[PDB]
Design a protein around this ligand. Sequence first.
Ligand SMILES: O=c1[nH]c(=O)c2nn[nH]c2[nH]1
Ligand SMILES: O=c1[nH]c(=O)c2nn[nH]c2[nH]1
Ligand SMILES: O=c1[nH]c(=O)c2nn[nH]c2[nH]1
Ligand SMILES: O=c1[nH]c(=O)c2nn[nH]c2[nH]1
Ligand code: NA
Ligand code: NA
Lengths: 303, 303, 303, 303
Amino acid sequence: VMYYGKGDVFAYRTYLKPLTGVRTIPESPFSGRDHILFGVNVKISVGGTKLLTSFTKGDNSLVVATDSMKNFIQKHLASYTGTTIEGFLEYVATSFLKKYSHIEKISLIGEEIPFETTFAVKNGNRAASELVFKKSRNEYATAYLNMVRNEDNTLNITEQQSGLAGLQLIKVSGNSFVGFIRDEYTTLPEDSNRPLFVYLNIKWKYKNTEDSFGTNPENYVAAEQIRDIATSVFHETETLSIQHLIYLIGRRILERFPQLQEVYFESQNHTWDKIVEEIPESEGKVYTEPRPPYGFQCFTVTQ
Amino acid sequence: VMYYGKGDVFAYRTYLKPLTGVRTIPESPFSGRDHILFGVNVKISVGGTKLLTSFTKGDNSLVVATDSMKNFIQKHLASYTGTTIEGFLEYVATSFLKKYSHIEKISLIGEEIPFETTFAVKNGNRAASELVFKKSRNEYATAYLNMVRNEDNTLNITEQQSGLAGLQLIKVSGNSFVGFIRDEYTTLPEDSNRPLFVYLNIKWKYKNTEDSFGTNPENYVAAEQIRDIATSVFHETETLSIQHLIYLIGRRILERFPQLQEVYFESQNHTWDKIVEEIPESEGKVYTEPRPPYGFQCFTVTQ
Amino acid sequence: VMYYGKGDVFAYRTYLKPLTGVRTIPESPFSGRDHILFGVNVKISVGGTKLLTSFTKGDNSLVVATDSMKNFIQKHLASYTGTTIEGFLEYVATSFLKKYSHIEKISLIGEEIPFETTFAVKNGNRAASELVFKKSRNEYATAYLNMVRNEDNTLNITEQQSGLAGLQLIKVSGNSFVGFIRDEYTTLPEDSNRPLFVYLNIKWKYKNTEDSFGTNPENYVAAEQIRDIATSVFHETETLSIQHLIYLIGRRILERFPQLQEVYFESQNHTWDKIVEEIPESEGKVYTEPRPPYGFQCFTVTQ
Amino acid sequence: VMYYGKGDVFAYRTYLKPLTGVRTIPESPFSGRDHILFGVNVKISVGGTKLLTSFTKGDNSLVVATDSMKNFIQKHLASYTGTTIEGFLEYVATSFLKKYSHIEKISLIGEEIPFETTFAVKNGNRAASELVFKKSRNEYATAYLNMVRNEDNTLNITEQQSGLAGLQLIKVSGNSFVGFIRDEYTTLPEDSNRPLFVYLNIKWKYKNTEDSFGTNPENYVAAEQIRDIATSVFHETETLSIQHLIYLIGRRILERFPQLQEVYFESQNHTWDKIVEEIPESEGKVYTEPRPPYGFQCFTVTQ
Ligand SMILES: O=c1[nH]c(=O)c2nn[nH]c2[nH]1
Ligand SMILES: O=c1[nH]c(=O)c2nn[nH]c2[nH]1
Ligand SMILES: O=c1[nH]c(=O)c2nn[nH]c2[nH]1
Ligand SMILES: O=c1[nH]c(=O)c2nn[nH]c2[nH]1
Ligand code: NA
Ligand code: NA
């Protein structure tokens, strides 16, 4: 392995071109993005056989300083005329390979820094502010891209993936986990009705890489829509396990977006422990945080 | 100083009595809380001169185990019939002093563990789910209470405070910071138009402690309303400093809630650094994260 | 309340004046600090009636910019000729009040950013490197200082406190917790031999502020020496509770350092849960991490 | 992808069999581990075609509960008679595949939870306590192991890797970074003498998996010895870049440990910003923390 790059390249852009013209789905009212505030955290990795002596001999002649990679990314966010993170990564990658002939491969990760609408009273009525935004530490969109230069100096995207990260959902009832293996290692009781709490990281790949850029937005798959499918399916489903649930979520995603080739899930179980089961004259209970061990699942659904 | 207690007592309650009957204000559509899911993190501190030998001699005869304090809190959330965190703390404090005669003082902190509505398709239409909630890591309500036992075994609340924590707001334009001291220690340029980014912690005290419990909800001051005043005022104001802004927020809060005696602010400046000032044929710019040092302000406004 | 300031002011000085000649105690080898690398995280808060209109009217004419206070601190670290954080704080406080006549009160917190020696083979043998150091995320020394300007234009230190933070100690054997109250809320089983795991924050005050500065190192009390008393006493003691343990640590501290007026403890309990009680052909046991709730104690020993 | 498992499985064993007789190297004093306290954080992932219907149909009949895998790990730590994390992983892997015939693949990650000796005055003199230990949040050893069940029912280790994580090293002098590309994106000034601050994660593979277990300690490569080579080499070297530095560390590692097949580096640059270039009557300088973006390097040296 041989590569280097820059991490935590935060870049905030105002008044990016709005994303509109999206194709709707029943599970989501998502209709586009205003892009008054566009925040991204970018990681960049570059490689190439001509970097060897930078390691083996301390020769920096062909080293793009990582500081300069940060400048490159931030400058390109100012000139970017597109409407998605996926498109932004493509802009950066193509530009970077055309600038630096000795680099054979670039890998980029972009993670949305999300903001939420706030409201203000003005002109006699309360309405959404165009100036004040609330920084969110909840779920966010993600994007991944790998580009390579060939022997004839053409460039090819070799892998692309989009995603939604940091989704934390609890369903208070309508979940079971029964029937699992009961042997000398089992102390977990069967539960007919648990408050399943799951962390979801969902990633998806397109059949055609161009649909990820948003140039023809009707073919774009928004993380917001994926979020809304996941919450809807979790609601609709009498879950039998987290495994059971994410398969059904993946199925719904690929049904809604026939342009997707696959969807990949990384889930974690953070369900609370029960303390009070019976509350007189009430259907409530009390739960508390569990010990640190968490179950997890990794699963791909293919079109 | 001599006291002990328990921290990070997480307790999640389902179907608490809903909060309704709230008095509205122009800045906020807040109309109550469903309380399908009610989450609280509780810290408890207890003291009393009869605890001395537990320290000076290792005599545990009068020590309520901190583990038992956790049990006490969680059990009392199951039996609590009220509608606010402030009321919950009062329930716990009064119960605890009546149980343990040798304790002269209790101090409690409760921090909301907030959840957000999600949506699902069912019965032919998309609607808010009554079962699936999204865990939020953004702002949350808080409450503080101190109770003491007197020589005649009566109990008195000696201090109460409510608050909103974790509010992070950025205003992209309409802020200035000019006119400050320029001497041999000043290298900060004057800025006519900056994207002020502030962290706000806002606490408020009532003129009458009973108005904090929500038993007569019309007198309750909801953290949600405070949130909405802060976002509205930040929007409305051509800010001259963070000091300038939080004074105006405090003023609006005390005008809206004449039952409040004071409001206290802890603010932090996390404004981004400018990278790209001019973008051809566009009013956008690019900013990035600053170095770690942050300015802060602490300020009380009184009625 | 009315004040403002700067936090997370990191400053790293190389080749500070070494601290030498500190009187040793039998529990600790500590005699001084080489100060090849001296790292500190400072928080500064300033107050004054003349700051009012900075809040009420947005008048910045008497606002030292928080950015300037960061410059003030970092420049003063470069010009400090002393040998302790406590003395640095006094240097900064005195210089700042002398510079800015409109300030009536300055409060400073300094936290060491600690580093540890590493091995290097020098003349064919391993030695402590004078060049390479390891950044530690374990315990660190702290200092706190308040200074005011009086009616007659004199300056006076109103409060000074040194400390040790982040000490995490576990004693595998020789700890009991028994004899505590058993009633309807008690589920904690008595334990005659538990692996007590405590977090410790220890703060001490001097009889004479002068001694905090280290100008006469014979009277200086180093955090490193406090660390070593705490670990020796915890080893020596069959603890009966954390309460019992910290009282004994405090007594020893005050015996060794008669110039100290008091020692303050903030302790947390993080003892693991036992999973395996007895292992064949061994004295060993297996434990795991507990649920989040943690006990805590706070207690002051006076000379 | 299809697998599932348990993470953050903390397990603390007292009085594990000591590791003794490890062949020493001149850069490190390390000869073994007392194992009075042996702490590990395990992550387990299992796969198998027979798990499909657990996802597609919600059939739990062939689901080992993740909670049971936690029990499996913690019980096996109690019965492990070996002396290394690498050997523990093999013990667990082999036992788990033998127990559950429907599993085709197990992957294990083990991370040391490190502890450090403390001082106690025993017979009138300070010594390392056999009872009291300090929890460290600095560097720690790691291990990784994949095992499969073949067609003919035999088990085979498909991958094994040991490592060291969380090493943070700063060298105050003797580091340059010069001669890198200067073009329209370059703003980083050349530096002939910088206080290079690097984060290091080092992972190594053995020529013979057998050597990882420590059954014959003469062939075991301890993370502690890797730590000491890294610090010695960093001291010895006038570094020309982090790239240059890690290549040299790798070469030394492989020279000292000829049984190793390769060494892999993941390095980050966290060098401070300089604030004061020259201080009168001293060789010292002042620095502060940089903006968030950090450089990183990844490189593999082979035997
Ligand atoms: O949904 C679940 N899947 C699992 O594999 C599991 N194991 N314990 N609990 C569980 N819940
Ligand atoms: O609003 C502000 N208040 C301040 O005190 C300050 N100091 N630097 N920038 C600042 N901004
Ligand atoms: O040392 C302890 N003190 C306490 O007060 C306590 N309560 N639970 N466990 C405890 N251990
Ligand atoms: O050692 C370094 N390598 C790099 O690639 C680099 N880029 N900026 N600074 C750097 N330092
Ligand atoms: Na729209
Ligand atoms: Na309503």
